[PDB]
């Protein structure tokens, strides 16, 4: 039968300049009462302390790309990237990744400079995660809450939340890095509260009926237009800017070059752009991710068969 | 009679993560033709090369606070802040500050994460600068173009543009640091073109009739609410957020504390908040600047008496 989630973490500041999670984590470390439910208490964690102190995404390496078994399992060294060192600590705290000692669930908080609104990023189609999203949607009529299915292309998962048995990322934008907006802070805070409510209901044995829902599944990235030297030759087109999750159709403009020309989408199908013009993605060569919108059937989670 | 402005510079990337100026400066260095007018050609300059390369505001010290006579005149040292070293180079290029060798005019380009729209920041009430703003307003009906008079409180001016005999800052927001928006890029680009048009007209001997206009004069800053340790205890209130240049009246809410309480403005007069929730200003302890809106009379600039 159903195993309750008793070891639950909420991580903020995985990227040190994403301010909602930074300040929620700091606040809850001073005031943990908010994270307590009848069946469990969630542990708040500031994921990247040094980056947070410096208010930057990362010091040496992206922490949210440093949690592969290869990194975690490798022999230490004084000259290791700071974030590799910190990944190993999180592995001790919340893992070890891939063993029975790992936490039951980690909720990881993110901001984006893209106009995403509320987005749950899941690295698998695990039905619990889809039920969680569905619950948030129903708790918030008229507020988009979208599930972005981002399955790792490589061999190894790499994210902070992947350390635990299961987990999910709550991402909210748009918000400039290093800026804390009251509106996003409060909303993220209430959504976390609701996610903890959900886990509590689950722990109490609530039946979650099977249902269908639309999700967005990652197809790949499109890079900024570049010169031969890889310097920007333009940026996201005004008609694409801020239109995350909206249909992008072949023939439609996606970039405006500095020379004044328009670049058109040359794909065969309508896709759904996500994370359009994210500051942190310039160096990753990503102007946006392409996703396909798909209707999936989510099995029931019942206490008994 | 009238002295024409023949040595004119446009500086971008004074802060390395403010993307319009960074990319305009880089573009114009490759394609200077755009900066040429019949009577003069403006020199594009990337003000902070190392910060720009790292995409950060500054390395050691804010370049736009490093151009005091004290810094510029002090004896060099290997252990000098990078930006102090670079300030001295700009002093060689565009100055020396306070001598007859200085450039006639420097236009310095900025972005802000605050919802300022188009703002010209002037460090004095020099009539040329007010005529320039008035010209931009008339060239752009229905587009706010506001003059922010920011006279240095201290003894010494400190900004990159203060190196020249005269100058002004063109600031545009909102834009996240490290993000280039097509819309702001194009608009800043056209406004620069118009500013160069203005200088050309001036050089040709055009009479500029006296006129009146509203400007915004700096009164001082209000800091974020803090704990005894100086950590944020809250942020800009949702009703104040994004309302730059709008009236702020005593009794109105300016902050939302994490504890949930509202903080009200306690001033005696209606003021006009500017640079509300700028990322770079957190460390400067500035949540917003207070300004007074004043109608001033601008004398004529005529070719002859
Ligand atoms: C803007 C940002 O940091 N986005 C996150 C979103 C994300 C990506 C992959 C994940 O596995 C989880 C979250 C990231 O790139 O790390
Ligand atoms: C966001 C930002 O960098 N604003 C500028 C605006 C500014 C301030 C004072 C000046 O003298 C000129 C521009 C700054 O603080 O340097
Ligand atoms: Cl459900
Ligand atoms: Cl966007
Ligand atoms: Cl005029
Ligand atoms: Cl603002
Ligand atoms: Zn992030
Ligand atoms: Zn600036």
UniProtKB/Swiss-Prot annotation, chains A, B:
It is a peripheral membrane protein. Its cofactor is Zn(2+). It catalyses: an N-acyl-aromatic L-alpha-amino acid + H2O = an aromatic L-alpha-amino acid + a carboxylate; an N-acetyl-L-cysteine-S-conjugate + H2O = an S-substituted L-cysteine + acetate. Substrate binds at residues 57, 64-65, 171, 281. It comes from the Eukaryota. Binds 1 zinc ion per subunit. The keyword Zinc applies. It is found in: Apical cell membrane; Cytoplasm. Residues 205-305 are annotated as: Shielding domain. Optimum pH is 7.5 with S-benzyl-N-acetyl-L-cysteine as substrate, 7.6 with N-acetyl-L-histidine as substrate, 7.6 with N-acetyl-L-tyrosine as substrate, and 7.7 with N-acetyl-L-phenylalanine as substrate. Its main location: membrane. Coiled coil: none annotated. Changing residue 281 to A: Drastically reduced activity. Exists as a mixture of homodimers and homotetramer, both catalytically active. This is N-acyl-aromatic-L-amino acid amidohydrolase (carboxylate-forming). The lineage of its organism: Eukaryota, Metazoa, Chordata, Craniata, Vertebrata. The gene is Acy3.
């Amino acid at each position: 039968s159903r195993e309750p989630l008793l070891r639950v973490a909420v991580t903020g500041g995985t990227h040190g300049n994403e301010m909602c999670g930074v300040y929620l984590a700091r606040y809850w470390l001073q005031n943990p009462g908010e994270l307590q439910r009848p069946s469990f208490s969630a542990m708040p964690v500031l994921a990247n302390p040094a980056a947070t102190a410096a208010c930057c995404r990362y010091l040496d390496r992206d922490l949210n790309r440093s949690c592969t078994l290869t990194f975690l399992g490798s022999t230490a060294t004084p000259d290791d990237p700071y974030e590799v060192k910190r990944a190993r600590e999180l592995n001790q705290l919340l893992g070890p990744k891939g063993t029975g000692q790992a936490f039951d669930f980690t909720l990881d908080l993110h901001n984006t400079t893209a106009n995403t609104g509320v987005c749950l990023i899941s690295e698998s189609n695990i039905s619990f995660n889809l039920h969680l999203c569905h619950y948030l949607q129903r708790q918030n009529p008229g507020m988009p809450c979208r599930l972005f299915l981002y399955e790792p292309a490589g061999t190894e998962t790499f994210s902070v939340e992947s350390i635990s048995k299961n987990g999910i990322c709550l991402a909210m934008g748009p918000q400039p890095q290093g800026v804390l907006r009251a509106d996003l802070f409060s909303r993220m805070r209430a959504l976390v509260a609701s996610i903890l409510d959900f886990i509590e209901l689950f722990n109490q044995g609530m039946d979650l009926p099977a249902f269908e829902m639309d999700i967005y599944r990652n197809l790949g990235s499109v890079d900024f237009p570049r010169t031969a030297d890889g310097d920007l030759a333009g940026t996201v087109h005004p008609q694409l800017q801020d239109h995350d999750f909206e249909p992008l159709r072949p023939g439609e403009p996606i970039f405006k070059l500095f020379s004044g020309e328009d670049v058109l989408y040359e794909g065969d199908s309508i896709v759904y752009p996500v994370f359009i013009n994210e500051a942190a993605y310039y160096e990753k060569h990503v102007a946006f991710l392409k996703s396909e919108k798909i209707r999936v059937t989510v099995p029931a989670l019942l206490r008994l068969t």
